[PDB]
Each structure stands twice: as C-alpha cells, then as structure tokens.
Nucleic acid binder design. Structure first.
Ligand SMILES: [Mg+2]
Ligand SMILES: [Zn+2]
Ligand SMILES: [Zn+2]
Lengths: 262, 69, 147, 56, 184, 140, 49, 115, 391, 32, 42
RNA sequence: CCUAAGAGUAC
C-alpha cells in the first residue's frame, strides 16, 4: 500500500512509467533528487605531463571531466573529503591514464576507449568509461596531427550533480501530470480556440477526457504522474530511479536522526 | 573548436556522435534532420548541440606542430 | 546579449533542478524578463527564437535574411507540423514545487554573444594606496590601485 | 575644479550592480572581497573590546 | 544590374539571364574543365555596372527584379509592398540586403527590429567573443579571447557566409525562456 | 450567531464580465418587492443560472450557540457543526457602506475579499445589519 | 581567413581609416545668414592632382 | 573570485547544525525550524506531509535567499500537540511512502523482458 | 548623480558574489539598470559622519522627494505586473499557497485571515492576502473613470483600515504617484514602515508570480484575421484621403492656412492624416487584444510598454520624421533613386505601413534607420546640454 | 534553367554576389 | 576586424544618415558616443 | 613616471 507504479517502456537508457497514488510534492522531490543528489564517478583531477596538441590543457581537462564513467558500485567508494589519505588513494578514487601519440600521417582521434585504469579497483564495478556507439570508440576527446603527443593522468572521485553537473547521471527527465487540464492548473493562451491550438500530449490517451458539461471538480488533487527517466550511462536507468528514491529516503532519515539527537 | 562532450541543457552525451553524424551526412547522403534523428537526438537541445557545431580543430591541425617529437 | 540589442548581465544562476522545465524535461539555458520586449519592440528576437526552434527540430538552417518572404505564419505552421504550439509557447512546470505554471512560457533556442565586459575586470576597491606625487591625492585607475 | 571642488578619495569601491528581490529597500549587497578591502576605524571602548579583539 | 529594352519580350528586363547564372555556378563549382566566368566577365559584357552617388542621381533603380520588371488572393501574413506603378527602370538592385554593413549583416530579421536596436547590435557584435583567427596559437597578441565551443547560428542570413561567420562564429545557441520566473 | 437577515431571491441576470470564474448577479426578492441584491459569485465553485431561486442569509457568526475576525481561522475538523452545513455556498466579508437610498430604502455594501455585494431594501428588516463583519450563506 | 589590408609597424598591426573630405574642383553655392552683408557665396576648392 | 565553493551547498560548515528550533511568539504553540544545507527538495515535501496532518493548524517554509542553502519552516499545531511530534510523524510518513514506492518500482521493473 | 536621491545611505549586507546588489524599487531614483551599470560605494570613517549619513541620507528618509512633493520610489517591473495579476477578482489562492505567502511577510501577526469563500472550498482572494502586507490603519480612496461605490470594472481603489475593499492594484496605487499607497503610508506611519511595506509587498507578490508564471512571445503581437483586414482597410482609406488632398493641392484648389504657405499646409494635413491613421489602427489592434494577451497585461499594469508600442508592433509603425518633417528629398527631388521625381506619396516620403511583425520593406527600413539616427543624435546632444545646464 | 535567355529570379542574384566576393573580397579597397 | 578594415572617419547636420548614403554606407552601424554619424562603415 | 592619441562602458 502506498504509491503505485506502472511502467510503459523499458530500455537500456530510458524508462517511461506512471507514478500513481502519490502527492505532487513527493513526485517533484523524486525528480529533483534524480537530477541532483545521486552520487556518481567522474574524473576530478588531471595531471598533464605532455600536451603538444592544439587544445589547451584545461580544455582537455574539462572534456575529460565530462566523460561518463561506470558507477554501478559507486556506493562502495568513499568521498575524498572523508578519507584518511592525503590527496587520493584506492579507497576513494580511480586512477586513469591517457597516453596518445600521433604516429600516423593522418589525424589520430583520441577517444575515451584509450583511457586505461591504473589503480586496482579491488573488484568493484567502477572506473570503466561508458561506451554506447556501435563503433566501440567512446567520446572523441582530442585529435592529433603527426608528431603530436598527449600524456596525462586522471584521478576520479565520486560526486553529485550539486557540486558539478559532470556528476549528474540523469540527463533529461520528462515529467507531466493531468494531461487534460482537469485540475485547471494552467490557463491556456490562445487566439481563437485553446483546444485546437494546443497539441494533445501523448499521455491524453491514458485518461478519460472531460465531459465538457460537468462542473469543475474542486476536491480533486494531483496524482498519476507520467515520468520518463533517461540515463547518461553511468548507472542503469532503473538504478537511477531506485537510487533517487534511496537518496530522498536517506535525506528524510537524516532529518529524523538530527531531530532525535538534538 | 571540437565537438562538446555533453549537451549543455539536458546533459546527454553527444561527443561520440560526431563521426557517425559526418558519416551519415557523407556516405548515406542523408539530410541533417534524418541523421540527427537516427543518432537518437530527439530533443532540440541535443539537435542544436550537434547541428550547429563548427569543427575548427581541423584548421588548427593544419598548422605544423610547434613541439614535434 | 542577443543579436538584437538585448544586452544584460547575469543576475543569478540556478542549477538544473531549480529551473522551470517542459513536459519533455528541457530546461532553459537562459531566462530573460518579458518586460525587455514591449518597450524595445525587438520583434526580430521573438521571430528568430521561433525560427531557431523550427530549424533545430527540422534539422535545416533558418533563413533569417532581412528582405525575404519568410513570415511568422509559415514558421508557425512548420512548428505546429513538428507537434509544438505554433506560437512557441510551452507548458512549463515550476522547478521548486513541480506544479504547472499558470502561464505558458515562450521557449526556444536563441543566439547569444558573450561580451567582453566581465565583472572580474571591473570590480575595484581602495582603502588606502599610492598617492599622486604632485597633489598628494590618490592615483587614477584600477590598474594603479587608484581612487 | 580638478583637485579642490572634486578630488579622488580613499575608502571607495566601484563595481557592477545586480537586482535582488530578497534585499530590503535600504540594504545594499556588498561583495565579500570589497568588504575585506574597505575598512572602518572603530575606537576601542569598554563596550566593544571583545568583538574588536576577536576581529583582530 | 543593367536593364535594357529587350525587344524580344516587349518589356524592360535585366541583361543577365539564366545562362550567365549557370556559367557562374559552374565556375564556382569548379573552384570548389570549362571556361572561367568571373565577376570581371559580367563587368566586361555589360551585365553589371558601377554606379556612384553622382550617377545614382540620374537613374531609376528597381528594388527586386521578380516583382518590379514584369507588368501587372495575397497572403495576409506577407508585408505590404508596392510596384511603384512605373516602368522606365535603368538598373536593378542586386539585393537590398546589401545596403547593410559587415556588422549589421549578422542581425537576423533586421527589418523586424526598431532601428536603434540594430545600431546597438552593430556596435555590440564587435565586442562579441569568438575565434578571431585560426592561428591564434602562434600569435603573441596583447589580449585574446576565445570561446570554447563557438556555434554557427540556427538563424542565419545569406550574407553571413561571405563574412565567414559560419566558419568563425562568435556566440552560442542558448535555450532561452522569456519568463518572470524568480524576479532575479 | 443569529441570522441577521434572510430571504429568497430570484436571479434575473448573470454577468460574466471579463472574468472566467466570477459572475455578477442581480436578484429580486420574491417576498418583498422593495428588496434587491447585487452580488459577485464564484460561479466556477458554485454555478448559478438565470431564473434561479436562491435562499440568502446574512449572519454575524456560524456557530449554533450564541456569541459569548479577531481569532485565526482554523481548518474545519471532522464532526464540527456550524450553520454553513445547512447551505451550499458561504462567503465571509466586511460591511463598508450604509447608504440612504430613499426615505425607507437603505443599501448595505459588503466586500468578501473583493467580491462585492449590495443589498437594498426598507430599513424595517435591514436594520439588523451593522458596520461589522458578516457571513453570506446561499443555498439553491 | 586573414584578409590582409593592414601594415605591421614595430610588430603592431595598423590600419588606415578611410578619411572623408569634400571633393575638389566642384563649384558649391551657399546662402548666408541675415547679419552678413554677403548673401550668397560660390566657392571652388581648386586642386591639381 | 567571490564565488563560494559549491560543496557549501550541501556540506555543513564548522560550528553549525542541521536543525535549530526557535519558539514563535506571534502565535501560541508555534515553532520555527531552520534547516541548514537544504533546499526546496526537502522543504516542499516536508510542508506537504505536514499539511496532510489533521492537527497541524499552520505549516509553511521559505528559502529567504537563493544564495544560501537553508530554509525556515514554521509549524503550529493544536493545543497539547508538540510541533516536533508533527515533524516526526511527517518524516515517518514520508519514509514509509518512499519505501513502498521503491518496493513497487523494483517489483514492476522485475517484470520486464526488453530491458 | 543628477539629484540628491541618486546618492543615498544604505545598510551593508555582505554577499558571496562580485556585484553590488540592491532592491528593485530603489533603482528608479538612481536611474539604474542591470545591463552593465556600475555604481560607487563610500564608507564614512567617523561616528559623526556615520550618524549624519544614517539620519539624513538614509533611503527611507528619501522616499518622498521634495522635487515634486511625491514619492520617488515605487513598485516596478515584475512586482507591478504580479500585483496587478494577483488582485484580479478571478485570482483565488488555496490553503497551502496562502500559508506560504503569509509566512513570506516578515511582520505577519500570525493569524490566518478568514477566507473570502468558506464553502464548498476555502479560498482566499488575492486582495485578501495582499492586504496582509498593508499596515493596519491605512485608508485610501481613489475613483477612476466611471467607477462607482460598486465596481463593475474593479477599477478605482478603496482600502479601509489596511484591507483592500476593492480595486485592482496597479501603477496608480503602488507606483511613485502622489496620493498613492506609498505616499499615504509614509505620511501616516513614517519612512521605516513605508520601507517595510516595500519589502513585504515585493516578497509576497514575487512569490505569487514565481508560482504563477508570466511570459511574452511572438503570438502576443498577433491580431486575428478580421482585425488585420480592418487595419489594412483603415490604412488604405487614409492613403486615399492623402491622395485626394494631393490631387487638390496639385490642382491648386487647396487654400493655405493662415500663418503658413501652401506646401506647409499640405504637409501638415498629410502628417495629421497619417498620424491619426496609425492611431486608429493601433486602437483597433489594442481592442482586439484579449485580456490574456501578455503585452496587454504589461500595459495595463503600467510596468512596461504603452499603446504606441502595441500599435507599432501589431498594426503599423507609422510616419518616420526627421527634424520634425517627413523624409526630405536628399537626392534631386526624390528621397531615394527607387522613386520618380516629385513623388509626395506616403510611401515615397517615409510612411511605414507595415508593422514590426510583418517586417519593413527596404525603403521603409532605410527611412526608419534615418529616424533612429536622428533619435540617437538627439539623445547624445540632450545629455551633454543637460549636464552643462545642470552644472 | 533549360532556356538560356530566361529571366533570372531573386534567388539567382546571390550567385552574382558570390562571384563578386570571389573576385573582390572584403578588403578589396585597401589592397587596390 | 572586418568592420575595422572597412571604416571611414569624418574629421570635425553632418551626423544624420543622408539619403545618398543608400547602398554605400551601413544605415545602422555607428558609435553611440560623440562619433555618432561621423564614423561610418562601408 | 609624465604627456599625447585612439578605442570603448553607463548615462
Ligand atoms: Mg543601463
Ligand atoms: Zn582515500
Ligand atoms: Zn540535450
């Protein structure tokens, strides 16, 4: 008993579902947590050894920080801020190394498949850059003319989207409720007819259209939210939803804990 | 300069869809809209991320390297 | 600033979760005040936003040449053929509460320039510093720690 | 006109302005760097010895 | 453009026809084996003419050929235009949008703006940030500003591909919402 | 607590005006020919049509017990008993004018949060109304 | 993409702004104000190239 | 230059606590609770769950400035009901609902074959 | 800093960003925008200067200006539009949003006002919530055009004991106008209470507008088909009248107005006809605009825009003038080389019959450029001359 | 198109402009 | 850079946009300050 | 360091 969920579409990177019997505040809080509060792995520090390319060092550092990394077992990693090491260790970071040389007469593309994990993952499931395309090459990090070299090391720490958007695993989150505007939460702008000028949402097929003669239902509340979560690739989209719920529950539990302890 | 890794607005990774986009434009003679739809860029934020990119890095690569090994 | 004389400075920056969002999860990169539109009569700004939305959806390039026969009605017809409201309005939800905004928001891509005037190159303060040799008054200019 | 009627002065700051609906009518927001640069001289008094010592 | 009597059609017409346009297109395509056809070829065959203000005093110019050369259910969305009710033209404008300068050719739909706004944009696009040259990495300029990711405009003019604006853009396509959101 | 005024009116006109949720109605008393009413009503929350008979009661309070606002409003708990239970549409407002229409006719003006009401009739039964707050209760 | 049309003086790129002037060898006739005794003046800025 | 560190949005600073409760003198049996390093995500949820309670006369929250991540929540309950008890009940209800939702979503996802 | 109100004493609030931050209502005396304006800050260095700065130059003490014995600060921009939208008779607020809005008022006494509607659903009107910000004991009564004690149009303003009895709150009430709410409050309760009123009104209205939303778009400049047809008919009729006047003048049948020549009278008549044509077309467009039109809403609130802006954007830009005259014959007897000699038609001398929505023809674009150039030159000359005169 | 002496359209003039800028350039006056 | 290379200056109503400026100088490209109209662009 | 010149920001 409680909030009820029915999922329409399931994919590797998208889940489209219905969230019924739930308050609007709860659904919006879940959406916000999925956007912002889910921990993820991403490259945080870059030590540049050699860069004879045409791009600036911090340009490449930023591009590397935007590379999505596997974060299935990110809960087994610790934040660098609350680890006993000096700068970075194996309990709180993953070390990668990008070493590329332009030994070909044509331009050599430095992808994210060339990122090599150096630190011992200790059997975790973190660190690997996410590969999505069929060619197998990851994100196009840089390009090299013949004789140009790029040697650098990356330290990846866990983080959340609040500190920096590079840690956000959730991409775009579709969120809609009351497709027929039965709650009258919007006043439709129009020129001649509001119904003709506003295209019907795809979710209108899942609710009974209003009878156009019935009185306004002032007691009705908002529920049955149609939500589509997309995944960047760091964690599966179902894990995105589950970890969002978990993080929100953790926040409320921490509020209870602070209240009791004070 | 070079293709951005992620769409600015939503954050979808688009840095791996540049060479595929160029291959679709050239080899298959597809127009830009169909090629964008093929790669999975449905929101116009991602579509403007990939459609309007200018690959200046090629120009930068034309000049001889300053430090050649 | 846009390409129509709509200069302005960044007031505040919100994260993605706090920005208003459409039913498709698209959030704006920029939010500008409606009150900048009516007095300045920059209709080209709105027309170019609509044309850019259509061009991004359709994959073509918007022909915004001055004296062509490109009208708002045709752009709106194309936008409606793409499944959006013809005048560019979109139903948006408040970021904080998730409730629908009672007013639909004009929403779409627009070309913006970053101008050379950054605040970090203009902020300046001086408690006490170098004095002019002749008049024994503070020197001139923020580059000289002036007054 | 350039040195007596008007002159350059110390203890002055200048920067870009922004709007804030959450500030009172008689309030002005000051950047922390500017507040750290500009200073006020407070005479040491029995009524404010403690806070002045803490600021020192 | 030069307009002659053109007795074959019985009415005034431009000296330039589809054949010259085809030859110019062929030359441009070859540049990107036939006889070259350049602007000097149009100049030397009496197709186009150079007119200054003094000579411009004593000529009659047609704004566009398709609407003003031929002798006489309209779209209400289109702007109102007149035919001038006169057929004695001596020249034709190559394109009205060529009255603008380099800075004003970047403005999208400048005819839908109040003119001071166009002046402001003309003065303000010179302060826009982008890629000023491709070899900025080998120049020791006193100050240089470069965008990370310049983007060619979604709304573009025909005159801005002669200014290389699509090759060296100075801005980005941002998703803009016009809203009184927070009061900030 | 007691009903300061009560009557039955018939609506002769409903004016949507420039509004979508509020309509101004004119009503004539079906018992006294000298009593008439003008009233703004939230038609979205209480539909009203022309030629509709409405029982209208103005009261100084809603509690059944006599009077022993200045007290903060509280949401109605389950099981609470009040006069509003016997009516369909209840508003709360303040009286802001007592006008002498004629020798016998007087008009009283009420403002329920901006929804205006004007009740006109002979003073022999409108004398109970005074310059204070009041509740307007309407049933169909 | 560099277009040229500028000089390099001491390593600095200098451009000559096109200077506007009135044309020479053209007769121009101007009215004069009421206080002046001369009513109209015809002048030519004669110059040989 | 003057931009604050981003981790200040969620990390408690030195010498400050997550919650602080101050009685309200405007109305009887009312408290104001300042939540630190929180935002609308928690504030709206807590306020709605408090309004779901029957003995809560007043419940509201406000973020006084977007610059700082903190919010103030005012709660006023009926006589004999501790506002802290109302907050505890609201948090407990939120946790129970979220747990049920997580269970339901897991069960629904387990029914897919095209994932 | 042309006047004393452009130099005022504020209270420091240390903030973590590189810009000076100030209230929106205080920008009017400073004549300040946020499009790159810089401002200056001076720190007193003694107790005497500090005290006289706080007791003489403080912002609340400057609310009523001696310049025109009326307030110099008011409600502006988003807050004005929001306060107009909030006080409409249609605006009703449910319990949760009412509680949030009440809490946002710092000096709220802690009592929830009885809802305007109790059954079948407790609803608070916008006027009821806004009256919380207004201090107790304030009475204001303004009668607009055609308003009675009953307000069928909800215009005018009646506030009794700090409660808005009726009237839509807009620029005439909360703006910097004599006899408005700001003036009454500062003359009755003092400058400090007026500043607190500024803060409370801004906070509550900004919260409501944040959770209600307000926008503007291209569709706000579009009038429907019949209205555009009527506008075109009006423009054509005016052009026909201009043509008839031109025929009369060219037949010498026109008589010169006393005090001016034939040509001056003809130009005066033509300009008047074109101006009233533009005004009539703009009025048609404005009447056609619905109450949901966003530009119309901004104009009604008084926050930004005017009737002429609607007219020029939707109906007709109008007649472009240089030096108080129609576009002169820069070439020999013609304005441009695209017109014949001695053409005095409205299009030949700078009548822009197209709106900004429709777009300007090349000749109209050039004429509008000439008008804008004249405006810019006038602005520069005016600011220089006014500076010298002021000194 | 097929007819060699057919009149040009408003779109064709951009070809002429292209030829102009292929021969002159943007800073032709300085160099000339 | 392009605008600077095609700039004309008039040593010093001359500030007005003349009719003869059609097609020779930009109708709307000029500094807002004291050089409004005096500095022109081709 | 002074002087001169030019470009520009907000009015
Ligand atoms: Mg400004
Ligand atoms: Zn560690
Ligand atoms: Zn995107």
């Amino acid at each position: 008993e409680g909030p009820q969920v029915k999922i329409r579409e399931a994919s590797k990177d998208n889940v489209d579902f219905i969230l019924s019997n739930v308050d609007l505040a709860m659904a919006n809080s879940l959406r916000r947590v999925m956007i912002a509060e889910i921990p993820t792995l991403a490259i945080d520090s870059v030590e540049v050894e050699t860069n004879t390319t045409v791009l600036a060092d911090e340009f490449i550092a930023h591009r590397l920080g935007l590379i999505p990394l596997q974060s299935m077992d990110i809960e087994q990693l610790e934040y660098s801020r609350d680890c006993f090491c000096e700068d970075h260790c194996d309990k709180c970071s993953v070390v990668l190394t990008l070493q590329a040389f332009g030994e070909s007469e044509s331009t050599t593309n430095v992808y994210s498949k060339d990122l090599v994990i150096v630190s011992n993952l200790m059997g975790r499931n973190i660190g690997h850059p996410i590969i999505q395309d069929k060619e197998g090459n990851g994100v196009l990090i840089c390009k090299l003319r013949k004789g140009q070299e790029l040697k650098l090391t990356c330290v990846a720490k866990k983080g959340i989207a609040k500190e920096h958007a590079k840690w956000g695993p959730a991409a775009a989150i579709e969120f809609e409720y009351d497709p027929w505007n039965k709650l009258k939460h919007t006043d439709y702008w129009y020129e001649q007819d509001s119904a003709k000028e506003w295209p019907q949402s795809k979710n209108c097929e899942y609710e009974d259209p209003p009878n156009e003669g019935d009185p306004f239902d002032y007691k009705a509340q908002a529920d049955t939210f149609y939500m589509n979560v997309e995944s960047v690739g760091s964690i599966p989209v179902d894990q995105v939803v589950v970890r969002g719920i978990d993080t929100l529950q953790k926040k409320v539990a921490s509020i209870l804990l602070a209240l009791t302890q004070m | 300069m070079i293709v951005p890794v992620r769409c600015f607005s939503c954050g979808k990774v688009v840095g791996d869809k540049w060479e595929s986009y160029l291959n679709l434009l050239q080899e298959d003679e597809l127009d830009e809209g169909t090629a964008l739809s093929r790669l999975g860029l449905k929101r116009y934020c991602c579509r403007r991320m990939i459609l309007t990119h200018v690959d200046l890095i090629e120009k930068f690569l034309r000049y001889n390297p300053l430090e050649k090994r | 600033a846009s390409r129509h004389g709509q200069k302005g400075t960044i007031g505040i920056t919100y994260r993605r979760e706090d920005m208003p969002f459409t039913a498709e999860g698209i959030v704006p990169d920029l939010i500008i005040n409606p009150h900048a539109i009516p007095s300045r009569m920059t209709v080209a700004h709105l027309i170019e936003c609509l044309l850019s939305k259509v061009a991004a959806l359709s994959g073509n390039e918007g022909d915004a040449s001055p004296f062509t026969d490109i009208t708002v009605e045709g752009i709106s017809k194309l936008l409606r053929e793409h499944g959006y409201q013809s005048r560019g309005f979109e139903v948006m939800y408040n970021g904080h509460t998730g409730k629908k905004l009672m007013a639909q928001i004009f929403f779409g891509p627009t070309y913006y320039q970053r101008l050379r005037h950054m605040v970090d190159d203009k902020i300046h303060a001086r408690a006490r510093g170098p004095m002019q040799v002749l008049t024994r008054q503070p020197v001139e200019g923020r580059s000289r720690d002036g007054g | 006109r350039g040195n007596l009627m008007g002159k350059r002065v110390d203890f002055s700051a200048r920067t870009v302005i922004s709007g804030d609906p959450n500030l009172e009518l008689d309030q002005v927001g000051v950047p922390k760097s500017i507040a750290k640069t500009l200073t006020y001289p407070e005479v040491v008094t029995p009524y404010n010895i403690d806070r002045l010592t803490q600021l020192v | 453009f030069i307009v002659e009597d053109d007795e074959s059609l019985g009415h005034k017409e431009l000296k330039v026809r589809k054949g010259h346009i085809a030859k110019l297109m062929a030359t441009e395509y070859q540049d990107i084996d036939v006889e070259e056809y350049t602007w000097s070829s149009l100049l030397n065959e009496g197709l186009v003419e150079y007119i200054d203000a003094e000579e411009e005093e004593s000529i009659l110019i047609a704004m566009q050929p398709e609407d003003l050369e031929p002798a006489e259910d309209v779209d209400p969305a289109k702007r109102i235009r007149v035919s001038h009710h006169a057929t004695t033209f001596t020249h034709c404008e190559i394109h009205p949008s060529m009255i603008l300068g380099v800075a004003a050719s970047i403005i999208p739909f400048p005819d839908h703006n109040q003119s001071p706004r166009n002046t402001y944009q003309s003065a303000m696009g010179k302060q826009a940030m982008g890629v000023f040259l491709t070899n900025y990495n080998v120049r020791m300029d006193t100050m240089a500003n470069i965008l990370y990711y310049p983007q060619k405009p979604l709304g573009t003019t025909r005159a801005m591909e002669y200014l290389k604006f699509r090759e060296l853009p100075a801005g980005q396509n941002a998703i803009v919402a016009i809203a009184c959101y927070s009061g900030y | 607590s007691n009903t300061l005024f009560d009557d039955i009116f018939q609506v002769s006109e409903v004016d949507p005006g420039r509004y979508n949720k509020v309509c101004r109605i004119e009503a004539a008393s079906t018992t006294q020919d000298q009593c008439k009413l003008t009233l703004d009503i939230n038609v979205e929350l209480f539909p009203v049509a022309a030629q509709d008979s409405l029982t209208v009661t103005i009261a100084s309070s809603l509690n059944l017990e006599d009077t022993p606002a200045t007290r903060s409003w509280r949401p109605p708990q389950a099981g609470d008993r009040s006069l509003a239970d016997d009516y369909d549409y209840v508003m709360y407002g303040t009286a802001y004018k007592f006008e002498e229409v004629s020798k016998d006719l007087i008009a009283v003006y009420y403002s329920f949060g901006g929804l205006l009401m004007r009740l006109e009739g002979n003073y022999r039964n409108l004398n109970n109304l005074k310059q204070e707050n009041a509740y307007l209760l309407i049933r169909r | 993409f560099d277009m040229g049309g500028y000089f390099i003086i001491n390593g600095s790129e200098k451009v000559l702004i096109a200077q506007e002037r009135s044309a020479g060898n053209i007769v121009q006739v101007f009215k004069k104000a009421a206080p002046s005794p001369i009513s109209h003046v015809a002048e030519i800025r004669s110059a040989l190239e | 230059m003057n931009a604050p560190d981003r981790f200040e949005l969620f990390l408690l600073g030195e010498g400050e606590s997550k919650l602080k409760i101050d009685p309200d003198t405007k109305a009887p049996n009312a408290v104001v609770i300042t939540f630190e390093k929180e935002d609308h995500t928690l504030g709206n949820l807590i306020r709605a769950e408090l309004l779901n309670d029957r003995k809560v006369l007043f419940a509201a929250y406000k973020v006084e400035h977007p610059f700082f991540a903190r919010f103030k929540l005012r709660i006023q309950t009926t006589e004999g009901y501790d506002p802290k008890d109302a907050l505890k009940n609201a948090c407990n209800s939120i946790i129970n609902k979220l747990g049920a939702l997580k269970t339901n979503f897991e069960t629904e996802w387990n029914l897919q074959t095209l994932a | 800093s042309l006047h004393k109100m452009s130099m005022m004493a504020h209270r420091v609030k240390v903030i973590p960003y590189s810009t000076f931050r100030l209230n929106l209502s205080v920008t009017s005396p400073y004549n300040a925008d946020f499009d790159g304006d810089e401002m200056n800050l001076h720190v007193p260095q003694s107790e005497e200067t500090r005290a006289e700065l706080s007791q003489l130059c403080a912002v609340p003490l400057q609310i009523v200006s001696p310049q025109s014995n009326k307030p110099c600060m008011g409600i502006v921009q988003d807050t004005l539009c929001g306060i107009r939208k909030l006080t409409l008779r249609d605006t009703f607020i449910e319990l949760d949003q009412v509680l949030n809005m009440l809490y946002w008022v710092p000096d709220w006494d802690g009592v929830i006002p009885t809802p305007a509607i109790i059954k079948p659903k407790p609803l608070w009107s916008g006027k009821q919530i806004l009256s919380v910000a207004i201090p107790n004991g304030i009475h204001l009564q303004r009668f607009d055009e055609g308003t009675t004690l009953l307000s069928p149009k909800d215009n005018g303003m009646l506030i009794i004991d700090g409660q808005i009895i009726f009237g839509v709150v807009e620029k005439k009430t909360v703006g910097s106008s004599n006899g408005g709410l700001i003036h009454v409050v500062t003359r009755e309760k003092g400058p400090q209470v007026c500043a607190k009123l500024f803060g409370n009104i801004q906070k509550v209205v900004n919260f409501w507008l944040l959770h209600n939303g307000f926008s503007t778009g291209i569709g706000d400049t579009i009038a429907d088909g019949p209205t555009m047809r009527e506008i075109t008919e009006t423009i054509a009729e005016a052009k026909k009248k201009v043509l008839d006047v031109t025929k009369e003048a060219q037949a010498n049948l026109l008589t010169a107005k006393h005090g001016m020549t034939l040509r001056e009278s003809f130009e005066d008549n033509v300009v008047r006809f074109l101006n009233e044509a533009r005004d009539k077309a703009g009025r048609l467009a404005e009447v056609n605009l619905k109450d949901l039109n966003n530009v119309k809403q901004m104009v009604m609130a008084g926050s930004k825009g005017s009737f002429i802006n609607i007219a020029q954007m939707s109906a007709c830009v109008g007649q472009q003038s240089v030096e108080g005259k129609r576009i002169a014959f820069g070439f020999v007897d013609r304005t441009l080389p695209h017109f014949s000699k001695d053409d005095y038609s409205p299009e030949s001398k700078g009548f822009v019959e197209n709106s900004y929505l429709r777009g300007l023809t090349p000749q109209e674009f050039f004429f509008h450029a000439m008008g804008g150039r004249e405006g810019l030159i006038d602005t520069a000359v005016k600011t220089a001359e006014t500076g010298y005169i002021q000194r | 198109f097929e007819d060699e002496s057919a009149p040009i359209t408003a779109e064709d003039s951009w070809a002429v402009i292209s030829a102009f800028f292929r021969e002159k350039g943007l800073v032709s006056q300085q160099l000339d | 850079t392009l605008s600077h290379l095609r700039r004309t200056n008039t040593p010093i109503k001359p500030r007005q946009l003349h009719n003869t400026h059609w097609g020779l100088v930009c109708p709307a490209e000029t500094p807002e300050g004291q050089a409004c109209g005096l500095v022109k662009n081709l």
